[PDB]
């Protein structure tokens, strides 16, 4: 989550119906756009961010939210348009002994600006005494491990989170949804559309 992946999408066609097949029950919160109408209007570039977060901390992935994940690992701007997808992945990211590959920052001097990444590993001097890199007093490592286990509750289970962000630029749109087609009728007065040709 702290080192969240950033992916850029350009020059392709987007079918968002497949997105709904992931889980029988999952969140599909969308900001500034109705999910059922994503197939008609369309933009220039698409940014996708994916990571793993705790079950009860999925509520912090939203504009204007605050907490631990909101201002220390991943910050969403208030003027954000897009959708957030999160589904339970306990069967894939769990260890009976305990998973430890997922790290999150816990100590930082200040908050995080929207769409900002902090990968530093410097020790955090909470107090006034400079420890110069030893986990003594008021000096704790910013990163902590997510001890995922299959025996945990739904509030501690790992949720895979994918966020898509859209924007409009003066460059023409290239990444969007498919268009419709209806056979072909001959010798019959019919209204028609051909790539916007009335």
């Amino acid at each position: 989550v702290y080192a969240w992946n950033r992916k850029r999408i350009s020059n392709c066609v987007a079918d968002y119906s497949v997105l709904y097949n992931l889980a029988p029950f999952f969140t599909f919160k969308c900001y500034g756009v109705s999910p059922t109408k994503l197939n008609d209007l369309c933009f220039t570039n698409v940014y996708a961010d994916s990571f793993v977060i705790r079950g009860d901390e999925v509520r912090q992935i939203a504009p204007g939210q605050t907490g631990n994940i909101a201002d220390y690992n991943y910050k969403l701007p208030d003027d954000f348009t897009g959708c957030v997808i999160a589904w339970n992945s306990n069967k894939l990211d769990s260890k009976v002994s305990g998973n430890y590959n997922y790290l999150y920052r816990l100590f930082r001097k200040s908050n995080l600006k929207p769409f900002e990444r902090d990968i530093s590993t410097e020790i955090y001097q909470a107090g006034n005494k400079p420890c110069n890199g030893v986990a003594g007093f008021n000096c704790y490592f910013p990163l902590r491990s997510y001890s995922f286990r299959p025996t945990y509750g739904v509030g501690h289970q790992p949720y895979r989170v994918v966020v898509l962000s859209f924007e409009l630029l003066h460059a023409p749109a290239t990444v969007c949804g498919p268009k419709k087609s209806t056979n072909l009728v001959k010798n019959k007065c019919v209204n028609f559309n051909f790539n916007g040709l009335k």
Epitope: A126, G127, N128, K129, P130, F137, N138
Partner: antibody, heavy 123, light 106 residues
């Protein structure tokens, strides 16, 4: 107001377990730390262990590392310590100490202290 | 792993004069990783000197530490009736934390 309120004295028997907690209020308890020490009547202080309130990392004394555990709850902002294998020489006053914090800069060293609990192990 | 010898065990001074307290460590300890505690008979200890040179909040100005290399010293520049109690000093380094034997002032 900054204060550390601890529970009351308890009396147990050898071979049982002892549980004591102290509540912290009046400051930023999310970035503090708590240490546990014991002291018999007329004896010198002895350190047991400490835990990070926001991390859970523990560091125990060499002697008691096999019979001490440290647990904290963020919801109740409470620090818990448990001692197993009670003996007749375990009768001492237990204290919990935490530094001062203002959510921006924490105090260096343990300044404030609790009231203390007297525990007696007898049969 | 860290030893802080304390001497003398007993002190006999009258108020209005200046006393001395010494906590001599066996190895090298950084000045920012030690603290001095004083408790009245039956009461919990309070922090007096942290950083070997800086007082705490509410500490009377009569107390002034020395902060040597490895052998810390605290000279009481002015004695009061409250100052007659037992004193303990603790090391805050990476080694397991130990307390001194304790110095009593009469």
């Amino acid at each position: 107001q900054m204060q550390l309120v601890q529970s009351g004295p308890e009396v147990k028997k050898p071979g049982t377990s002892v549980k004591v907690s102290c509540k912290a209020s009046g400051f930023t308890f999310s970035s503090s730390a708590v240490q546990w020490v014991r002291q018999a009547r007329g004896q010198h202080l002895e350190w047991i262990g400490w835990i990070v309130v926001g991390s859970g990392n523990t560091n125990y004394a060499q002697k008691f590392q096999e019979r001490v555990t440290l647990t904290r709850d963020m919801s109740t902002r409470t620090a818990y310590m448990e001692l197993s294998s009670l003996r007749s020489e375990d009768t001492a006053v237990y204290y919990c100490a935490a530094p001062n914090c203002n959510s921006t800069t924490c105090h260096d060293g343990f300044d404030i202290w609790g009231q203390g609990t007297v525990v007696t192990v007898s049969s | 792993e860290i030893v802080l010898t304390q001497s003398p065990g007993t002190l006999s001074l009258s108020p209005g004069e200046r006393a001395t307290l010494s906590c001599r460590a066996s190895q090298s300890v950084r000045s920012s990783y030690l603290g001095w505690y004083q408790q009245k008979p039956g009461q919990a200890p309070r922090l007096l000197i942290y950083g070997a040179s800086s007082r705490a909040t509410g500490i009377p100005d009569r107390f002034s530490g020395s902060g040597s290399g490895t052998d810390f010293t605290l000279t009481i520049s002015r004695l009061e009736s409250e100052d007659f109690a037992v004193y303990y000093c603790q090391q805050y380094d990476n080694s397991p934390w130990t307390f001194g034997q304790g110095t009593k002032v009469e």
